[PDB]
Structures are given as structure tokens and as C-alpha cells.
């Protein structure tokens, strides 16, 4: 009936039924195959935490957030959270990858939702009016104003996916600064005219939710080693895709790390992506600023010399803080920037980075800076 | 010859045979009698921490930070550390309120190193010259380069004085917003060109120490309540010394806090300052605003239909990053600003408050909306 | 309505009205001036706690057990939590010195319940039977099998005043083995039989508890050092007081730590108790075993050769596992010895020590072993 | 030439170039493959930290402790450290699987430092014979009381290795119940007649460590399921190596988690192994009980009814305390027993489990009740 999961994040997750039969499922048990962070564990090695662990903690967050909400619909958006990540590709950036060899571009999730057993598991229990409600909710599509706040809990600016992937990765790569009191956040949440706000007396604990979002941008996800891995992957996995034919869903479902790091191990016609992610040959960072002149004028300097083939640009950019957070205070609705000077100090993350070949870096530095 | 003290903020404090003999003596002792915070355990129940702790902690984080700089006197800044609090009388914010009951100004540290036995116990181990080289190094007085440097030590932005407080002050008061622990801070300081600096590897580091900074004051030093009690507080200590002479050091050294509040809890001249102090009958806060001409125009109405009395006004404007930081780069030394947009942008801390007599206070309220 | 107050145990406590009321009354107040731990702090620097604290803590643990079994009398249960420790006189073991003095030998909790403005306060929202009834309950004095449960919950094994001290006190003093998870083994009690019982998913929450609660005991309530400093203390509180008469309930309620510390620090006819107190003479230990046999035998060799009156004697005993708690398992009750190996190997702790004056310690040693 | 690593057990882990060239050969990278839990994770979703990891670990801990201890040989017996599990199996328990199947038995530890590439690294920092000490430093096979002592501090009763495991497995299985940070054990460790010994100082620490084991042993390694999943392995792994031929170390070396999984996962032949150990059909836990007799009895009733093929039986017999430890006392060198009367009084784990064939569970325990 309840079955507890440890898990150090929040000590057990107790789950339902209808959880535990999802998680016995062929496409949620996948997902233990599916590494949260990608090739990221190349940088910070202790991150070895998957999508498993983490549609259980969402689930989680996803329960205590409708608790402190008073919401009606508690188990249906409780398995939307649990759901969320079921049609997740292995590694980062890569359902933009997937997308475009599907003729139809259905969002995987809906479709594994749809076409495997997941589908009858959830007829036991809803409607297939229902599912189509928890396909909208958990996929951030909602058709009305009711749908848009469940989603909301899930897919947020204080989302409960969110709010477990900030905390979860920063517990297994090892950064402090991405902790934040989500006890006291979660309790400090309201409804008001059909939107999550905070109440006053949570202000501290929305800035220091917004302060640790930071940490996590600058420190592991848009980390220079780990964006460059990522741009070989996903290269990688254009080419091993590239005939793959997405009509049958168990095409998507094979699609797992071990999969994608086997064919990169073992097949020679790969030798050179497999060099750059797994023998230490990545692009070297040549360059990596907050000014996008300076890189703009570097990047034309550099492609006016070197073949375009021996480099690689990354522009990555965040807010931080979107304008759209209101906080419920003695005289109605605010902006919590009105509030925070912390909150408004805060600016996009913007950063900019040019890589290139080992073998051009010394080349490309002095004939070039 | 060498003891050791629980401290749960690092697990033990290790201190030799020089230290022992000062933190036996009884200026030091004192120290056990005088809360970190004064008051402020009237709103933060647990803040119960003392200056004695604090200056264990001091000279525990001092001997970490020499360490990490492989500063030569380490000996003499640790014991700087441990007597910067020596010259401290109770409660917050009292320095202002003593020297000018005090014909010389002469700050009370150095007449409590010099005129006590301090000063006997310092000479088994020191040099004249080098005690008055102590006195400087922790006052924030130096006369050359290296005293400046082991002055930074102790009292610069991230001197171990603050360390120590920022951290102790969040885990008595229960501030669980900031990161406060900075072995990662300390790791990556740098002596360069003879000052403190950090290395850029701690930038990430520096920004949390930053942050956790703000949070204090946000949610501690400048709390509305702690404030208003610190005025109540301030006015009764001034009547207390009206003309107290402290050419005599023992009539400072007998100043701690049940000495003022017996002087409080006793005399039925003071009774409204016990009243405001301890029965919670202190003024109530009429207006909070980040609004200069917000609180300039209350101000205005509020002195035309209330006297001067039952009324009290405090502005506090605290800059959260001071610009005089530097960070060792690849590029040589920088200002913490010029490599992270993040400091840069972070604003000053402006808060206005208007408190009002418990009684006026529903009067003034509707008499100014 | 509710006022939040900072607790670095548990994050924030809320208090409702009645218990705001009798918070801020005089009695109440008085606990912010006696420290959890009496003398402790000249051994454990940081251990600065006072009783208010842990009343405020006894609160929220109420609550939170109440909670979890589901008991009907929740208010009233709570209020004998947070009034728990009214007649706590200051110090440690000293209600034994107090009771002898009053002819009646109340207990002093009762009389500040029913002599002061807290009996007022309580019959706003009680009739004096319930008063009565929460008497019996905070006391440990219930005339009836359903006072019997209700009392478990604050004076139990598993009690919320317990479960408060030993974490408090781990926090303060720096005692990470002290700490438990409270949280898991509150939501593993169950009511059984009139009892409160722990469920067996809870059996591992029941070790570390017990563990726990060892660890204090050996490092803290009974370390060598804070035992002597309260036998002397405990001798020189007998002469304060010998004369003094609580016949009005107002001369318990001016004893707190500051007025005994202040007798000392300036009467002469004290000087002695001072300087064994807090002139570092307290008497030194000569002997600390294990082995009672040992002990008796020291004993009698010195009793045969100095004066009884500059040595003293402590045996100090505790059941760690007292044989009386039932874990509902699959078939009914067991006793947790049967399933745990860890609380089948608890034994009782025994020590038994012999002190010295300081100048006799030598000749004690040498003379004797 | 020194590289940091984040873990989040230590902060960051420095390793100097002899390390990293270890670091990123072929068989150390293979660690990242090898899960320290081996099949743990399907019981405790985040036990996903790999060999890899705890090696770092291992080196970190290993130098941490030769620092505390003043050992001269101090980079050895941290490559020592940092090389232990090099020729470790995927998966618990399969070292005793492998070596049947290799004609001399030689340890697979040896072999992989002496028949790849690691050897030459080896060789460009130390001679051929501290290569030879290296081996049996880390293989806990010492020749001399030097080669003793430094094995000691890795394989040792608190080794390096334990230090590591037990405080890795606890944060990523989330064991809540342990305290397991051992920086204040490491501290009070001495060599004395050159044995690694606890000061009488640490004796609390010592306590504490052991409870910790005891905790990770039934909370984690002796779990019900965990064991049955390992049993369900054990015998698969065994017909995967069949007569599998060692002679080659690639052989070895290509076996990995995921290798072992594959072969499961795909090959029609081994359909019901794969049902038991990733479908959810293990064994279910028919019994579980300290108790011998009610094992054997019920083992004699149950082969009367049940084929041999559909059940398994477990024994788990394990020393918490082993009577191996010394404490150096003011009086010398003690058995921590003789000093601590609880480590004197910790009981053995003794645990029997029986497990059937999930179809015939509700027949056999009807049958037996
Ligand atoms: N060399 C190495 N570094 C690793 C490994 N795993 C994690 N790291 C860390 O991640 C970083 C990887 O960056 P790297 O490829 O060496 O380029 P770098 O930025 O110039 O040091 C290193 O600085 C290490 O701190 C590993 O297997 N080998
Ligand atoms: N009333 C009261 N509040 C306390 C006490 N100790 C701490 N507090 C906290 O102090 C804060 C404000 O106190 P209060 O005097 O009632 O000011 P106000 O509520 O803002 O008007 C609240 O957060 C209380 O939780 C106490 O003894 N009495
Ligand atoms: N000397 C000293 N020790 C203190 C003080 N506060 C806490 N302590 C600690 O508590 C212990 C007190 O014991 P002490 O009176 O010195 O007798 P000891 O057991 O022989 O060291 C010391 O070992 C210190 O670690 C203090 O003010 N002075
Ligand atoms: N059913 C199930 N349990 C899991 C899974 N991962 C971890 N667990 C935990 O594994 C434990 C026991 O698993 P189970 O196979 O159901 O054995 P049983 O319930 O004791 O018969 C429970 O604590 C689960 O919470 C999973 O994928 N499926
Ligand atoms: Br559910
Ligand atoms: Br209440
Ligand atoms: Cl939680
Ligand atoms: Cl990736
Ligand atoms: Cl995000
Ligand atoms: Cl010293
Ligand atoms: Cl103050
Ligand atoms: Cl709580
Ligand atoms: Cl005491
Ligand atoms: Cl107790
Ligand atoms: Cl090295
Ligand atoms: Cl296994
Ligand atoms: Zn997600
Ligand atoms: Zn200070
Ligand atoms: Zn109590
Ligand atoms: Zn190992």
C-alpha cells in the first residue's frame, strides 16, 4: 500500500500504489539507466545521481507542495511530477537532437506516456480524460487557468522539478552554495488569483532560492569543461541517430547512457568523438568572458585565420530572476524585486566561451592575443 | 600547554600555553558575561553566545588563515585575534556611547592590554615594541607594511573577526539563508603586493561569503525589533553614565550585562526603560520602507500631530560589497567587480523605520491613512 | 495570532495565543536567566542555553508527537510542555537543596502554576480542573490511565522535554554523537495499549535514540570536571539559601543564575566556594573508574589518612536501556532488547570518581597508589 | 601537477601528479564502471557512487591520516591507498567467484598494478622493490613491521578504506542514523610499538565510530533484499564465467557493471536470472530472525514440502567489535574493551534469513503456520 524509499535528500519518500506500479514499469525502471547530469560526472566524478531517483524526489516535492496549497487534484499532479522525466534522452541538450527525426516532433514524454504500458497502468485509476489533463500539466501545455496553476507546481519558477534537481545536484557534485531551505520556501508558498506566490514572511527563503539557482549556472551546469563535453556528445549523437527511425517508441526507449557510451568504446569509425569525451582530447577553453564584444572580436580574428572545424563557440545566458515572481504582502501583490535588494541586484548569467583543437591552442593564443 | 575547547562551530579549539594564560586572566574572563548580540536574544531566543567564544573562535580562525598565507608572526596575529574584544562593553553599539565619558578617547583595548595584568602576561612572552605592535595589529592601526598585512588579518572584509561572528552569530540566531562555513574561503586567500587577497578559484567562494554577509543583516543586525530595543537600550545606557569616570580601568572591567540590567531591574527612576527594554512594551514600528521620501513625508505628518518624545526614527544604510577587494587572476591582480558581474551589482542595503510610543500607535496609524 | 520565533534546532517555532500569553509573563520570562546546563559553560564554553529555549522547544515537540498519535487533548498537552520547567530552580541537582527549606515540600512547578499570574492566564481558556489535570500531567503525576498517556508524551522514555535537552544540549555544547533523528523516530510512535509504543520500521530511529542519549551522559552530564563544579556549587547553595524561607513563591522566582553568581563574586564570607567555583581550585580527580571495587577500596585508604572535608566522593549511575520499551512488530509487542543487538549490549553506566583538595593532591597520590 | 577534485564527503580531494597519472590510465578509469554497491541501488535508489570515487577517497583519507601520524613514507601508502581496488569485479561478493577461476589465484589487485601500464607509471617515481612493498602495503600482506604499520593505515580495523566506505555509503544511501565524520578519530590516532592506536583522548570518537559500523551493517550491507539481489547475482556471474580465461588481464579489465548487465539483459538463455535481480521477482523473504533454532526448524519443515531449487538460505554472523584495538591510557597500551565497558559489551550481528520462489510464498507459509 505505502512503500518508503530512502533517499538522502529528504531521509524516505513514502509512495502509493499507483506510484509504486508506474515505478515497476519498463519505462520508469529506464530511467535508472539515465544519468541526471550527462557526462558531467567527467568534471564533478560524484555525480552518479539519475533521472530515477530524481522523478521520485519530484514526486516528493510535487506532494509536499499540494499539501501546502490545499490543491484538490493532489494525486494527479503528484504523478505528473513522478512522470516528467519519462521521455528524458540520455545526457544534456538532447531532446533537441531527437526531436527532429520523428516526423510528427511529439514530445517523447507524451508518447511514452501514451504508447507503453504506461497508459494502461494509468487507466486503473483515471480516465483517459484525466491523462490527457496529466499529459498537459506535466508537459507545461495547460488549456485553462485551473490546469496552469497544477503546472505550475511542477514546472515553475518554484517548481517542485526544480526545487529537487537544484538540491539533488548539488548534493551529489559536491557545491554547498545550491543548498537552500525549501522546507521553509514550500511552507511560505500561497495561491492567489490563480498563481504560486510567496507570502512576506518567505522572502528570505526566495532569495536564498534564487542566489543558490546562481551557483548551480556558474559552477556545474554551465561549467567550460562540461559545456564542451556536452558539445562533442551531442555531435557524437547526430551522427548515431542520424538513420535511426523513432516510429517505434522501444527505438527511444533503448537510448540509454550504456548504449551510447558502447557504441563510442567499441565501433573505430567514432575513434575521434570517443578521444574527445573519454581520452581528455575536448576543445581547450581559448577563451571564456562576460564580454560579448571581446568574443565577437576574437571569433572573427580567429575564423579569418584557423578552418572553422577546429573551434567551437558557446554563448550560454540565464536569468537569474525573470520579473514575473510576486510576493503576497500586507498591502496585496508585489514584485519581489520592489522587496529584495538582493533580488534586484540580480542579473542573466551571460558567458562566452571559444574552445579549440588541442593542436592549434598554443597556435591560436599567441597569433591571436 | 596545550588545551582544547569544544566549540560546535569547528569541533575543538587548540590553544597553547600564551593563550591559556590571557583567557585565564580576568579581563578575559569577563568576556563569559557579555552576549555577542546584547539584545538581540529578546527576539532570537537562542542567541545566547558570548564575546569569550567569539575570541576563542577568533584566534581558532586567525591560526587557520596564517596557516593558509604562511604568515612568519603567526603566533602574535593569533593572539591579536584572541584580545580584539577585550576593550568591548555590553550590549551592541556602545563604543559611541563610552568615549565620550572618557577624557582621552583613548581606545578601551589597549588601556585593558595595558593597565592590567594583560600586560604582565604578554611581557613573559613579547618584547615591549612587539606588544605595541599587538596593540596596533588589533585595533586596525598599523604603521607600516607588515603590520597592515597581519591587521588584514584580523579586520579586513574577510578578517577572521568576521568570519567568526558571521558564522556563529547565523547558528546561535538559527539564520539558515546563508552558506557560512569558509575553510573553501580561507583555502584560496593569497598574500599579494602585502595585502590579503583572494585567488580567483575562490571567486565563487568570496560571492557566497558576500551573500551570507547580507543575510545576516537582513535578517539579524538590522531586524526592526532588535533595532528599536538597541534605541531603548542606548538612551538608558547613557543615563546610566551620565558622568561615570573610567580613569579608574576597574569601573569598565565591572561593566557587563546583569550589571546594567541589575542597575535597570532595581531602580524605579528607570522604570519606562525597563518597561520599553523588558516587558515588551518596547515602541512599535510604524513604518519599514526602502523609500527615502516614503519615510522623509510620514516623518513630516507624523511630527506635526505626535511630540517629539513618542517617537523614534533609524535609518540604516549598509553597503553590502565595499569595492576593496582584489582577486589574483591569470592577468595579475583585479579588483572582485572588475572578474564577477555578480559583486559587481550587488546594492547597499537602505532601510527606513519609524517606531511609535505602544499606546499612539493605532492613533498614528489611521491618523496618517 | 501565531508569532514565529528562530530555533537553530528546528528552524522556526510557531506559538499560538495561549501560549504567547504565558510566554510573556513574568514567570516564563525568569527561565531566559537560568541556564540549561548551570555551571556547564566553564567546561563546554558554548553552552549558553537557557531554560526559555528548551520550554519553547518542549512546546514544538509536543505538538509534533501530539500530532503524530493523534491525540484529542492536543492545547493542553503542549501547555504542559512549555510550562515544564517553571519551578526549575538555577543550576543543576538543586531542587533537592530547595524542597527541604518549604515546610510542604511542593514541588515549586505547581506553586508558579497556581501562585502566579500564570493561573490567571490559564483559566482564560481552561476550567482549574484542567489546570489541575495539566499539573498532573507536566509533573508526571497522573491519576488515570488517560493522564498516563498524555504524560508519557512530554516525561516519557521517548518524552518531548528528552528530546529536546539531548539535542539542545548536543547543539550548544559541541557534541555531534548527541544528535538523532528525531524527526523519523517521532513519526514511528505509535499508541498501543495506553502505551506509547515505536512501530519496527522504527527500530534503527530507537538505537540511535538510546545511543544518543549515552554519548551525552559520558561526555556531558557526567564529565568529571562539570560534576565536581556542581557539588561544590550544590554545597554552597545549601548556605544561601539555609536561612531563606519560599513561603512567598517571590523569593524562588529572584533566584536565578545572576543573583547566586553575584553572592559570590562579592561577599567575603564565600571567598572559599568562589575560588573552587570560578578561581579554577574546584578539587581535582584522583580517581575515575569503572570498578566500584576499586573505588570503595581508594576510598577507604584515604578516609583513613586525611580529613573528610578535603576530599570528595561522586558515583554517578544511569540506565541507558531501562528494560521498559515495546516495538509493535509484525506479531504484537517485543521488547526492544529482542530485536536490536545494539540495545541488547546497553548497559547501565557506572562511574564512580574521588576528588581532592588541590593541596593535598600530591601527597593523595603518591600516598595512596 | 596538483588537481582538485569535488567530492562532496571532503569538499575537494588535491591530488599531486603522481596521482593523476595513475588517475587517468585505462584500469583506474575502469573504477568509474563498477558501482562500490554493486546491485544496492535497487533497494536504495541513490547508492550510484562509484570505486572510483571511493579511491580519491581512499588517497584523501589515507593522507590525512599520514599527516596526523607524522609518517615518513607518506606518498607510498597514499598511492597505496588510492590503488586498493583495482582489482575489485563488479558487483559484492565476486571476488570469490573470480579467483576459482584463474589457475595460480594470484590476487587480481597485483596483477592489474604489475601487467598494465600502471606498472611504468609506477616505476617513473619508485624503485622496483617499493614497488613490491606497494603491493603488499595495499593487499594487507606485510614482511616487516614497517610494511605493518603502513598497511595498517589503509586495511586496518579504522583504515583509510573503512573510513572512506562507511561514510560514502551512508551519504549516498542516506543512513541518517550513524554519525560519520572521523576528522576528530584521525586526530587522536598514535603509533605506539608501531601499531596504529586510539589516544585515550579519542575514546568517545572510537565509540562512535564502531556504532556507525554497526548502523551501515543493518541498515545497508545486511539488508533483506539486498542480500537475496546478491544471492540472485552471485549465480548468475558464475555461469557467465563458466570457464572464462584470466591468463589475459583484458579480460578482467573489461569487465564492468554494465558488461555483466548486457549479458543478462540480452542473452534468452539467462531469461529467469534476469526476472529476479531486475524484474522484481527475488526470492521473497520468508523468514528473517536472530534466532538459530527457529532457522533450522523451519529450514528442516520447509525442504519437506519445497523443492531445494525454489528456496535460499542466508547466514549473516558479524563482529561489531573484534577485541583488536588498542587505546594508549595515562597507565599504556590497553584493549579499547578494557577502557570502554559499552565496546566491551557490543554484540555480534547474527542474522538468518530464508527466501522462496514468489509463486509458492503464500504456499509455504501457510504451510509452516
Ligand atoms: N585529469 C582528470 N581530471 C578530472 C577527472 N575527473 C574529474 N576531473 C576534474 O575535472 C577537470 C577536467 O578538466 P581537464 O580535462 O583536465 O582540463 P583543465 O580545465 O585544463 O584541467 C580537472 O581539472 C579535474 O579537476 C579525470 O578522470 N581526469
Ligand atoms: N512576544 C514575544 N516575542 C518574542 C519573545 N522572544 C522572542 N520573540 C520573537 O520576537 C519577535 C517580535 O516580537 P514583538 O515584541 O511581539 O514585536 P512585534 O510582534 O513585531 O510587534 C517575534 O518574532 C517573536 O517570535 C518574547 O519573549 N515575547
Ligand atoms: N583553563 C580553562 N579551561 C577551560 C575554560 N573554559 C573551558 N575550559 C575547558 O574545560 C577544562 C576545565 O578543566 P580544568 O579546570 O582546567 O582541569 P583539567 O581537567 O586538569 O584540565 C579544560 O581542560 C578546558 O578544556 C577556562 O576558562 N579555563
Ligand atoms: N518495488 C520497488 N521497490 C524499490 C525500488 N527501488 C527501491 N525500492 C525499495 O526496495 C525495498 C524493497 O523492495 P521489494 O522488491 O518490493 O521487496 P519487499 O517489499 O520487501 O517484498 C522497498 O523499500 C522499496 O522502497 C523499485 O524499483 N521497485
Ligand atoms: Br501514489
Ligand atoms: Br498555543
Ligand atoms: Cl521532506
Ligand atoms: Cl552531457
Ligand atoms: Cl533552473
Ligand atoms: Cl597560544
Ligand atoms: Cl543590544
Ligand atoms: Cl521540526
Ligand atoms: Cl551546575
Ligand atoms: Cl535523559
Ligand atoms: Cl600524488
Ligand atoms: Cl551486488
Ligand atoms: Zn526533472
Ligand atoms: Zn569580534
Ligand atoms: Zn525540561
Ligand atoms: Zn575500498
Known amino acids: 500500500m505505502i512503500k518508503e524509499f530512502s533517499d538522502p535528500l529528504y531521509g524516505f519518500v513514502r509512495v502509493g500504489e499507483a506510484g509504486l506500479r508506474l515505478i515497476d514499469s ?14 558531467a560526472y567527467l568534471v564533478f566524478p560524484s555525480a552518479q545521481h539519475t533521472r530515477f531517483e530524481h522523478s521520485l524526489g519530484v514526486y516528493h516535492i510535487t506532494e509536499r507542495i499540494c499539501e501546502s ?9 503528484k504523478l505528473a511530477g513522478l512522470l516528467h522525466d519519462l521521455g ?9 537532437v531527437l526531436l527532429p527525426r520523428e516526423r510528427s516532433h511529439e514530445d517523447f514524454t507524451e508518447r511514452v506516456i501514451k504508447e507503453t504500458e504506461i497508459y494502461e ?8 480524460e484525466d491523462i490527457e489533463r496529466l499529459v498537459r500539466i506535466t508537459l507545461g501545455k495547460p488549456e485553462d487557468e485551473e490546469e496552469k ?10 517548481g517542485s522539478d526544480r526545487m529537487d534537481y537544484l538540491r539533488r545536484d548539488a548534493y551529489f557534485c559536491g557545491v554547498s552554495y545550491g543548498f537552500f531551505d525549501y522546507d521553509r520556501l514550500i511552507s511560505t508558498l500561497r495561491v492567489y488569483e490563480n498563481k504560486v506566490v510567496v507570502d512576506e514572511s518567505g522572502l528570505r527563503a526566495l532569495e536564498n532560492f534564487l542566489i543558490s539557482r546562481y551557483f548551480m549556472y556558474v559552477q556545474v551546469y554551465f561549467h567550460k569543461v562540461v559545456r564542451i ?25 533503448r537510448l540509454n547512457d550504456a548504449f551510447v557510451i558502447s ?20 576543445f581547450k577553453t581559448l577563451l571564456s568572458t562576460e564580454n560579448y564584444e571581446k568574443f565577437s572580436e576574437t571569433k572573427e580574428r580567429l575564423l579569418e585565420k584557423f578552418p572553422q572545424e577546429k573551434v567551437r563557440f558557446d554563448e550560454v545566458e540565464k536569468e537569474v530572476y525573470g520579473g514575473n515572481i510576486y510576493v503576497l504582502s500586507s498591502e496585496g501583490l508585489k514584485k519581489a524585486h520592489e522587496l ?5 541586484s540580480l542579473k542573466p548569467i551571460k558567458l562566452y566561451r571559444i574552445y579549440v583543437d588541442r593542436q592549434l591552442w598554443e597556435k591560436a593564443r599567441s597569433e591571436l592575443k
Open 26 to 39: 519498463f519505462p520508469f525502471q529506464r530511467l535508472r539507466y539515465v544519468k541526471q547530469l550527462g557526462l
Open 340 to 344: 529584495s535588494p538582493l533580488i534586484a
Open 69 to 77: 496549497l490545499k490543491v484538490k487534484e493532489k494525486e494527479l499532479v
Open 229 to 253: 563535453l556536452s558539445i562533442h556528445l551531442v555531435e557524437f549523437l547526430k551522427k548515431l541517430i542520424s538513420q535511426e527511425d523513432f516510429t517505434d517508441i522501444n527505438n527511444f526507449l
Open 121 to 128: 497502468i494509468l487507466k486503473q485509476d483515471y480516465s483517459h
Open 149 to 158: 496553476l497544477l503546472s505550475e507546481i511542477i514546472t515553475g519558477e518554484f
Open 263 to 282: 557504441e563510442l568504446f567499441k565501433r573505430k569509425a567514432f575513434r575521434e568523438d570517443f578521444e574527445r569525451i573519454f581520452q581528455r582530447k575536448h
Open 88 to 96: 528524458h534522452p540520455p545526457f544534456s541538450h538532447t531532446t533537441e
